[model samples]
Target: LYFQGMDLTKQFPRSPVDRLGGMDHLKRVIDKARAHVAGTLGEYTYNCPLDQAFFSFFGLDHEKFAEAVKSRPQDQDMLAWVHSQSPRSKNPKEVESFNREYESRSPDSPEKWDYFRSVRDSLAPGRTDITTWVKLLDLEEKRPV
Candidate 1:
């Protein structure tokens, strides 16, 4: 059977800041996971650190979630499954905090920080304000964040 998915090698998933089910990074998670299941994930790592943050906060297993994505369900169906799986699904207040924390995330390691800084400098050297990973991703994607 053919598993259709985005060709992310030539494109990017949606911004991590985009909300799905009142959560940041969820849409991108779905995008990446969809591509992963279809074997079109390209250069993106399916369960990268950012995706792990979502799974960690929600108490989800990456493998299980990827299995669900393999079905290629609608976003709403996928979201319902996520709600069924996530411990924090009922807590909108915590979801808000989660969004805030993810949005504010910066490079946490020296190697990563150096790479982040170099990318930011190369993108826009004067953009000293682009310290957050979300902003840098948006800028990298050419979004006017």
Candidate 2:
């Protein structure tokens, strides 16, 4: 998949980021996560810290978002539903900035960084170079080894 140069849909696939993939892709990912929570999809986890990074960055209420999705609206109507609810900034600048923060979040906080280290070590033991959620996600998701 030629990287797609980082389209949110392709890059994260399951954890959609604001503006990185537009509304539809975001909605689909949101739906998938909700379903995972509802136990109707793959075991890709729901409401994990990574997904929360995007939700918090976008100013969406994680629980409310899930409930809204649970209302079972169509993808075409999801954006309308979102706009009708609480405030959310889809700003490009914020998205870019949020991407940076979300990607680099864990390693900054000792507790989360410790969790990150555990994840990275579990995926590839005896390695100390894993320092970012992006790398951890990439390694754990596809395991380039």
Candidate 3:
């Protein structure tokens, strides 16, 4: 229930649950990234800025997270470790604000817009309404964007 403002929010590949942005989901997300980076998960890109947002938001270093992943900790255990290690906002209002801003963060400059458009076009041509990189990632994953 904590997955607000996730890059994977209400887009493309529908979730059995929400986009699943909480630490519970984040470990899986980071695991996917780690595998992609390590060439175990083919066709998925690692360290994409979208993935970084989750780690950065919680102040979890990607390298450290990757190391943690290697140990294959249970999701709850990993979340506990992350909470113990990172700088998280305990205030609900501020956390809510963070979630709100992250969900709709769009490319600001022409070049970035162009790149975003290019990626989207390459992934799901003719889907002009989907403007964010996150949805494009959903599309890349064969999500019905």
Determine the C-alpha RMSD for candidate 3 after optimal superposition of all C-alphas: 7.4
Minimum summed lDDT over a 10-residue window in model 1 is located at: 1-10
- Highest lDDT against the true fold, candidate: 1
**Winner on TM-score (2 vs 3):** 3
lDDT of each: 0.85, 0.55, 0.56
Candidate 2 lDDT over residue span 1-145, tens digit each:
1211123433334333323234312543565545654555454555676666566656777777766765544554556555565245445555456556655545767887778877887888876766766666657656452
Write candidate 3's Cα lDDT for 1-145 as tens digits: 1122123332222321132324223544655644643545444445567557766777777777766655544555555566676657444454455566665677879999998988887876789998765556556767576
Query: Which TM-score value belongs to model 2?
Result: 0.56
Where model 1 places Cα greater than 4 Å from the true spot, the runs are 109-111
Candidate with better TM-score, 1 vs 3: 1
**TM-score for each prediction?**
0.90, 0.56, 0.64
lDDT for each residue of candidate 1 in 33-133, tens digit (9 for 90 to 100): 88887788787898988898889999889889988876746778778888898868668998998998998899989999999999999999999988999
User: Between prediction 2 and prediction 3, which has the larger lDDT?
Assistant: 3
Q: How close is candidate 1 to the true structure, as a TM-score?
A: 0.90
* Superposed Cα deviation of residue 51, candidate 2 (Å): 3.7
Off by over 4 Å in 2: 1-32, 40-45, 70-88, 109-114, 126-129, 143-145
Task: Kindly indicate the candidate among 1 and 3 with the higher lDDT.
Answer: 1
